[PDB]
Design a protein around this ligand. Sequence first.
Ligand SMILES: Nc1ncnc2c1ncn2CCOCP(=O)(O)O
Length: 496
Amino acid sequence: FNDLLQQVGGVGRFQQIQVTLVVLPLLLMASHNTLQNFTAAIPTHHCRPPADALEVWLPRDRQGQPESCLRFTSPQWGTGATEPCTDGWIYDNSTFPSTIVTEWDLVCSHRALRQLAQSLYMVGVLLGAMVFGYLADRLGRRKVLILNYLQTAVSGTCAAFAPNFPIYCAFRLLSGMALAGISLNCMTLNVEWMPIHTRACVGTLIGYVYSLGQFLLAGVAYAVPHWRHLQLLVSAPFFAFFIYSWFFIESARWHSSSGRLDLTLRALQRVARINGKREEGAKLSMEVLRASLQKELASAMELLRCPTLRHLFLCLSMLWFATSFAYYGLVMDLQGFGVSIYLIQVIFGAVDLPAKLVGFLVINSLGRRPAQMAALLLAGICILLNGVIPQDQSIVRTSLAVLGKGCLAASFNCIFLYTGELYPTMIRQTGMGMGSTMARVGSIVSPLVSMTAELYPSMPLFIYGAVPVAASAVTVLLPETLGQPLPDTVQDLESR
Ligand SMILES: Nc1ncnc2c1ncn2CCOCP(=O)(O)O
């Protein structure tokens, strides 16, 4: 197929149009994944005084600020009984006009609900990677993308107009399911329509576009602070994506695999018509297609079954869980640092750009494993130190969270490369999917861990730090891949 894709033009005039269009949605993946930092921000809440009759009606904490979850039973002038606040809460409207937290009183006893919603969105992301991955192999990378643009648009719009919390969570799970399928199918449709030598470039562009999405969330959230308006704005473009996605060309590779070379030929000729190498497309017929593509024409149980591939599976699963679990833990707590939540989102997104370069340098220059111990251990040390250092120190805490997020971004880049290199060709793609699945399990478990803040304010961070420190110790077991050719059989893994 690669000989044929190259026959039909060289990365020119279709691949440029379609890849631009298929990677444009990814800009708003960051906006959706981390949308709750802005759509669910917690304004300062203090209890509403009884209407019958704040200094007299609000108990004060050590800080001298009014206590969030309690109000005095009787008016205290100048040990007073404290009742939970039946009459609701008054929320500061200086920074956040409305958030899901203000709208549904997800405060005090129901504070965990704010994180349950993030976990549910991510349960949707895990489910969608699986459902839409199967559906794409059955119905096409394109048809599944068209339906996913419509689902994200409809679910996200309906979430913005959700009348109650259960409904917002349902439409956020479905938003995530669709978005998981968009992220997968954008990779498959672009990679399969692009030459093998350029495959790495496609993958990197997809990563950088997600990072630029972070700056998009910061700029958009500043402009549209209200949550219903911000959720609608971030889900509206997907309708426009759905409208132009009808003109995408289905992967000829998927057509060949299905058995329908008639559609492989039709796609290859259409692309020739676009790339401008028409003559060369006319030459392409079915006697030419059957020839050469002829040569082109294992189960996850294997990863567990073989002891050699089970060791590589377990170790890498710990590495993918840890990086995601910690990364989401840090990225989903922008308010505590003491700087604006918009500046911190911008800084975090601008740390990805030098992190990815430093990581590339260390990966190639030193090794692929030394980079993973360093990226994960340093992130763990930084997150644990962001737990120990007092809150008053905003600059020390911000700088250490920033460095830590950069290190976990490098770990994501290094684990994507290190994994492919570690697995044999037979179970390589299954292994990269299982690793990504464990990453999604990390993002489901992370908000649940954050709910332990009630037990101890620093327990969420101490766990967000200890898990990457343990994963760094696991990397020691994995085998170095720098300068070694990719394995083709289990025997090769074994020889290593
Ligand atoms: N579901 C996900 N699986 C793996 N990695 C993910 C997932 N969602 C977001 N990411 C991170 C994206 O790549 C790492 P980057 O933030 O440096 O681009």
